[PDB]
Amino acid sequence: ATRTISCATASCLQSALKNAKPGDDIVLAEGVTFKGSFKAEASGTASQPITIRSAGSVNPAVLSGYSTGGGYSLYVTGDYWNITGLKMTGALKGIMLDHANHVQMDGLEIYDIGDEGVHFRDGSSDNIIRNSHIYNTGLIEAGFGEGIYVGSDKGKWATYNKSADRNVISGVRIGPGVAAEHIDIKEGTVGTIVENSVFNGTGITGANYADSFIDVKGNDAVIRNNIGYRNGNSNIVDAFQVHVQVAGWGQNATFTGNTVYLDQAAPYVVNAVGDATASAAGNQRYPAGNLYQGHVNA
Ligand code: NA
Ligand code: NA
């Protein structure tokens, strides 16, 4: 690191973020809860990232908001942050990224969130969340309780840049207690990857159409080598869906190598609705039952 800033109070962290520089290593004391609405605004580079991390993993540092009904645990608006080994809780959103790029989130535990756990928004691209667990979301609004939310609905494209592109979700556990989709990939996004992840469907509510592990409304999504457990939750109607919200979106979704445990024969593995298009290969369904619906090239 170029500079080490060791913090054990919220005031220390707030100051370290305000004064953040490329190459900073902001190291948060184990066992401490840092309460605030913390803002990661500066930008690093690939060679000089800005790091916020827990000092160790026995008792990770916690970033808490003030109330599940407001704010965020962390709001990232700059590029080239490494956010590592932290817990995030106690806010309306866990981590919100606005126009933030090349952010690496690793080893996070994000839980007890009013709305959505992680949201890539306003053009935030080329980011990764890996080796993390998101659970207990949608405590305030179930229908806004996604685990991971990529991009913006069409009604917000005039407000936020829709092109939250090439974001990667790798080796993540989502659920239980995630009230909406585990992953909602919005129209306007391109190239989202969801890989090597595990979906515990207990707690998906069905609110606001949220009745699958993943809904794919963006393009060029790659959904590979994941495991989904419906766990008898009747609110889950399909493992994965693809929808067209705007013509030419919900296109070219690829589903390979996934294994889904859907309890009964009725849920589909991939339900590509209407004009949506997908390709599928190597997916395993338990028990025997419905596989693909729609324009699915199998
Ligand atoms: Na749905
Ligand atoms: Na949703």
Residue numbers in the entry: 36 to 333
From the study:
In this study, we experimentally determined the function of a putative protein, as a novel alginate lyase (PsAly), whose gene is found beside two characterised chitinase genes (chiC and chiD) in the genome. Bacterial alginate lyases can degrade alginate into oligosaccharides or monosaccharides. Lyases catalyse a β-elimination reaction of glycoside bonds to yield a 4,5-unsaturated sugar, 4-deoxy-L-erythro-hex-4-enopyranosyluronic acid, at the non-reducing end11. PsAly preferentially degraded the glycosidic bond of PM over PG and MG.
